[PDB]
Structures are given as structure tokens and as C-alpha cells.
Subunit: 180 residues, 4 copies
């Protein structure tokens, strides 16, 4: 059985960022299932690690809690990261979790990058911010980034969108089952 790590960084409840994140992981689960394999998904909510993250900034060593999360992340077979859009780019908190990760923490890690906001005017946040981020860490980011614009759900656009979620999931799924 494979493992799927998920990092959602929203601060709301219910969180839109968590929404799309689940739509993607579930889709990935279905895709890995279609390739004849079980998938264990473990979702990490950054809003729930603010204290530990804070500590890792003023201090140098990480809390047992944080240490367990990052070790499990680097052991997962696939990764999906998601984030809301503050100031036309990814969240500060979002970038903080990654600033704390070891240099070789995600090397070779299959990833789906995703963001969300009202409109799609900030969709290039994917290839101009998250992609350069995950690329720096040598993670192989599937070609299909998923930018969820809540204002465009329902109707032909939503069908098209849910269809794009599928492609991304297929892309990641292929990369996950191919691992030895």
C-alpha cells in the first residue's frame, strides 16, 4: 500500500483550500485504485502547526510533533500541496513549512501543486510561485497544476474543472505506482 501526503494551508472553517485538497487526494485515490493499489492518505493542516512552526523560527530544533510530520512526509510516496492566495501568491505560513524542511526533504517526490481563490486572475501563482518552489526541492511536479476558482464551479466549467482534477490525479497516480 502506498502513501499520499497532503499539505493544506487554509485558515478558514470550512476551508476552501482543504476542499480542493480533498477533491484531489480522493481523485488520486481513485486513480491509484484503477491501477490496482490501495492508497493511505494523511492530510496535514498547517493552521494546526503554527505554534511548532513558530518555535522552529526562534529556535533551531523542532518539536517532536513537527519532527514526526516532516519525517512521514519524506516517506510518503506522493505529495499534494495546496494553498489559498494572499497578496497574489502563496501564503506566508505555507512558505514557512517549506523553509523549515531539510534540503533533501522532497527530492524526487511526485507532486500535484494546487491553489485556490475567488477568480482565476491569479492562476499563474502555480507556475510562477509553487512550481519554482517545489522544483527547487527537486520534486517532480506533474504538468497539470490545479487552480480552483470557486467563482467558476458548476456547469460546463465545473465539469471541465473536475476533468482537469482527474488528469492531474492520473499523472500523479502513474508516478506513484511506478515507484519501486
Amino acid at each position: 500500500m502506498r502513501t499520499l501526503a497532503v499539505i493544506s494551508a487554509g485558515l478558514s472553517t470550512p476551508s476552501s483550500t482543504r476542499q480542493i485538497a480533498d477533491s484531489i487526494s480522493e481523485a488520486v485515490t481513485a486513480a491509484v485504485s484503477a491501477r490496482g493499489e490501495a492508497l493511505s492518505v494523511s492530510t496535514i493542516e498547517l493552521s494546526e502547526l503554527i505554534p511548532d512552526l513558530m518555535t522552529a523560527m526562534t529556535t533551531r530544533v523542532h518539536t517532536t510533533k513537527l519532527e514526526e510530520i516532516t519525517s512521514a512526509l519524506s516517506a510518503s510516496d506522493g505529495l499534494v500541496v495546496a494553498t489559498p492566495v494572499f497578496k497574489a501568491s502563496y501564503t506566508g505560513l505555507f512558505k514557512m513549512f517549506f523553509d523549515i524542511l531539510d534540503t533533501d526533504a522532497l527530492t524526487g517526490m511526485p507532486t500535484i501543486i494546487a491553489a485556490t481563490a475567488g477568480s482565476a486572475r491569479h492562476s499563474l501563482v502555480l507556475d510562477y510561485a509553487l512550481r519554482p518552489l517545489l522544483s527547487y526541492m527537486r520534486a517532480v511536479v506533474v504538468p497539470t497544476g490545479v487552480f480552483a476558482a470557486t467563482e467558476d464551479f458548476g456547469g460546463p466549467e465545473g465539469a471541465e474543472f473536475n476533468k482537469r482534477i482527474a488528469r492531474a490525479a492520473g499523472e500523479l497516480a502513474s508516478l506513484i505506482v511506478e515507484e519501486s
Copy 2:
């Protein structure tokens, strides 16, 4: 007017901090530049590493500490601004980003601004034009053309002197916008 103000954000986490060092060089040159234009400068340097609790309190809640309220209010009231960030994972720091996330939509509208970053080498010098610039522009801050990327491995010598002249240029650019305001 009766003494121009300058705000300086520095996101370094080491002691001593290389980010605070280029930040100081920048504000010192700005101080000289405003002096050359006949005026006086007041500088407010804000170390993000000293605001961690106030910052991550504004995260898990929507209200600011007296300290943060004083910082953000002066920031918006400032005539000039300088932002310096170390480079983590090939871009600005999450902590640096957090501060901005916390600001009002229009906290920095029209704010003359010099963007700056530092690291060992200059391989990531484009972090200015692809990460900090877009961020400051999105908030409608007017960013002076001369960004300042300090690669510590290239200090001193023919390179080090050329870099110090560069700081002055950014300083001059920012100084002009500063004394222009009325």
C-alpha cells in the same frame, strides 16, 4: 516634511544577521541621500524575528498587539520603505511573506520602495524581479528600478566597490521620491 521617515523591514534570523547588515547599509545611504537633498531622515528598523509572537498571534486571530499596531501604522505613514529578506528555498522567507499578508489591502499604496535580498552567491539574484517586485507592485507600492541583491561571497575588491555604488543609486532613487512627496 519636518523630517522625513523611512521604514525598514528585515527578515533575517541569524545573529549577527546578514539581512540586517545590507538593510542598514541601505538605510544609511538613504539617510545620506536625503541629507544631500537638504532634509533629515528618521529611520524605523523592524526585525521580523522580534515579532514572531505578535505576528503568529495575528495569524491565529485577527487582532494586532499594541506593538504591531504601532509598527503597521507608522509603516503606512512612512515616506519611504526598505525591505530585506534572506533567501530560503529560492525565494523570500515565509516569515517575510507573513508580515505582508498581515497588512491591510492598502497599507502600502503609493509607497516609494527599495527591494533587497541577500545570500552567499548571486545565483538567485532574480528573486527580486520575480518574487519581491510582484509582491510590492501588487500592493501598489512604487518600487525603485534598482533592486539590491547582496551576495556576500562577492564583497570587497573590484566587485565590492561596484556594489556599494549600486546601493547609492537605489538610495538616490528612493531619496528623490521621498523628498518629492508633499
Copy 3:
């Protein structure tokens, strides 16, 4: 009098790139008038300089037409750059022209940057493509960028957009009338 240079890289006829570029120049012309000055607007069409660009690549020296264009460009008070969006970024023909300019060709040039596509999902091309380009040439680009999403015209959003054009116009005008 003040001179405003305009670079339009449109290829179609009529050109949506020339349209936004015109709505831009016009607005600037007006705004420069409310500040008590006359503006001479000279619009350049890059599609009409094909054989020249094609020569400045294979050879090192420019042609009369091109040499008289760059000179007039580097001597204008203001500037406006417009371009279509091919492959989710600015035009190559567009980039080619700037590549041909001298190092200090636009140093200190007050500038408006703009682009035009169907939707707005590629609007970040302003800050992640043109801004860096113009900024590298030490040009001073007004905070207000103009992205004409031809579909979002008219209606409420259409109203907000015409204002944005005026804001940028006003911005450049001030820089223009401030130059002696």
C-alpha cells in the same frame, strides 16, 4: 511639448493590442492635458518592422528605419508597451525588439505595461514577464499595469477597467510632466 512612444506588437487586423494601446495613449494624452501640456503620440507597430528585426539578428548593424525608431524611442518622455499573449506570456516578436535595444535605451523611461488576451487567467504576465523586462532595463514602470481581458469588457467589470486605464494614465502623466 511632450513625446509619448507606443509599442504595439499585435499581428491581427483589426488588432486588439492596438486597441488597448490606443485607449492607453489617448487617456495619457488627456491626462497630460489636464496638467497643462500637449502630447505628441507616436505609435510603433512591430509587425511593420519584420525585415528590420530579421536583419538585426543575422547581422550586427541596424537599418535606417530601425535606427530612427530606437532613437525616437529613447528620446520620448513617456512610453507604453502593449502585446498579445502567446504561450501564456509576451510575444517573441515583442521580445526580439527589446533584445535589439542598447543597454541604456530606456533608463529612466516612465512606462505603462499592458497585454491583451481573451480571459484574465494569464494577467500575471504583467508582473512576471513585462515588469521584469522593463525593470531590467532600469525603466520606471507605473504600479498600475493594464491587462485587457477582451471578454470582461462592458458591465460592472468593464466599468472598473476603464478606471484602471485612467489611473495608469494619470500615473505616467505625472512622471511625464515632471520631466523638463
Copy 4:
């Protein structure tokens, strides 16, 4: 059947630094694919010798015989290496025109190594802020290891590390190239 590699260089000078790092990548890719038990065919295109063909294809949707074989072999290739000198802090306009000229689905799923060169490394991020977004938009799969050749840092420990980086990029591409059906 012999695997195919398409290469695109946008250097203007002669000799050309762009062409040189492109040859290294392609040669390194040939060894990597050789190590995996297969043979490799390499098609290297020099954009500065295709200018008129490009201008025509842009102004008109017509392709010269030369450009027709170039674009066809391109979409038909198993792997792609793209290289560009750095002008005005980004890729060449000539470089961009070429990709503007292609069909929207020309490189869909195409294994790719993006590269660029200059004197220093101050502009290395052109890779992940210009070329990468470009290739991604065309849904090509660009291997993690981009190659930026700072001609001022060859030789000694630095270059010794750079050649290894070239190898890592070739391995990544070679893998993608040979697992294709």
C-alpha cells in the same frame, strides 16, 4: 526503434556558448540512453539559421519545407533539450518566437531538459521563471534538473560539480525517454 532527441539552440554567435552547453547536454543524454540499453538519434536545430522560415510561419501560417520537417520531427521526438542565451534577463525573442510558432499541442507530454547560458550565474532563475513556465504551459514534462551554464564558473571544483549536474539531467531525461512505448 532508435530513440530520438530534438535539440533547440538560440545562440547567435559563432562559436556559440548556447550550442556548446546544448551539445554537452545532448552528448550526456546519448550516454545516458546508451547506459539504458538503447541507441539515440540527435536532431540539433539552430534558430539563427531558421529566422526567415520563422518570420514567414508567424506572419503566415505557412511552413517552409525546412520548418515542416523540423516541427514534425519535433512533435515526433521522444526527448527534447532546449537552450537559450540570456538577453534582457530572460530567454531570447528568437527563442520565444519558435515556441509561439508551434501548434498548441506540439510538446504535450514531451520529456524535457530546459537550459540557458550566460557569463555569470546572477540570472540562473530564468530557468524556473521563464523557460519552465513556458514548457509547462505546453504540458511538456520538464525534468527537475535545469541546466544553467555560467561560462565564468567552469573548471575546478565548481565545473566538476556542474558536469555532474549535466549528467543528472541527462539521466532523468533518458529515463523518461526509454520508458515510453
